[model samples]
Target: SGAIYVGNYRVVNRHLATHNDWANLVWEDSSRDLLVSSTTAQGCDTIARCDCQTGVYYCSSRRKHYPVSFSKPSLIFVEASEYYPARYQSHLMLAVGHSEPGDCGGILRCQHGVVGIVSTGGNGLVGFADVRDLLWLDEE
Candidate 1:
């Protein structure tokens, strides 16, 4: 789905304040963490962080601790680097881990290009919460 439709990058970028707006928006801990999907079908599972720079997928399963580079630009659609708060230091962190069968699996064959969970620094994730009047995009 279009970031405009699913996660309104347009609306968000426009109104997402650096601190007030973003800091004000309550952020809940990742139950299963943000799902990583190629299209926006909604992700379900758990892994860890994405260095985005050196390409390292941090370990989170408790089963093992390893760092694997995650770069899927050629196969998956990722938010632009600017999407990250500290574009230079931003990483897709594993704020949560998979505990049940709810959504815990998908190692290689999936090829989601190392997609799993992430923290957008402050930019906010768009879903069923975007409102149209959304002056964010209309501001500047």
Candidate 2:
């Protein structure tokens, strides 16, 4: 005789944010203080930062003497377990740049108990949202 077995399945959660206009999404991790920068368009040479726990986003390009251009935005996630002598815990940093009209770039760097994230260029028609859990299935 043959026997059949069944398996259990679970669904993941994902979030999406619609863009009313040209904008960027920068967020920080509450648990690890990691920073993330995302944009709605490409070829944006501006850099910004945000606090995830507080929902405060600000630009970091105020110090530039000359005007600079930015494109797409990216994100960075830092490890909290890293060793750091500073008052703040080990955290990640993210930055975004531009490359083209419909394309964006990104980078993630971790150093000295800190993580850095950056982007070059990409599309900016839509924004990014927090979607840690996501599952997809196809229907026939």
Candidate 3:
């Protein structure tokens, strides 16, 4: 009942250009996980007194939690993963975004019961599971 690694990623809040009721925030960072545009969605989340008609959301955990050398990059590729406790599996993906703290990575958040993923001979370790939608996500 113990794991050695416990880490988390930043939350991403995406904004739309106000061209449609639903729009996708495309992300890329050069990876085998060729980034793709998600289906049209409406408003990712909220920002206290924010501007820009923002909507639709997606997020991933940035593996690079350390600051870069030479110069600071506004955007980079972060790893994204989805786990299913029922089967003990994690789907990995790539995320692209700019940042300014802790590795200066992206900030797209999530929930419903997720913790990036846990492993290491972990069996029948799942205590709960579900497949619902609302999957609230955002980028900033």
Would you list the C-alpha lDDT of every candidate in the order shown? Answer: 0.25, 0.22, 0.21
Deviation of model 2 at 104, angstroms: 24
TM-score of each: 0.19, 0.17, 0.17
Give one digit per residue, the lDDT tens place, for model 1 in 26-81: 23212212221122233333222332322222222344423443333221223333
- For model 2, residues 1-140, the per-residue Cα lDDT tens digits are 00001112111101111241113323333333223334233331212232232121121232211112222233433223223222332222222422221111122211211012221113321112222211111110
Best by TM-score: 1
- Could you say which candidate leads in lDDT? 1
Summed backbone clashes in each candidate are 4, 34, 18
Per-residue lDDT for 126 in model 2?
15
Name the 10 consecutive residues with the lowest summed lDDT in model 1.
121-130
Deviation from native of the Cα of residue 99 in model 1, angstroms: 11
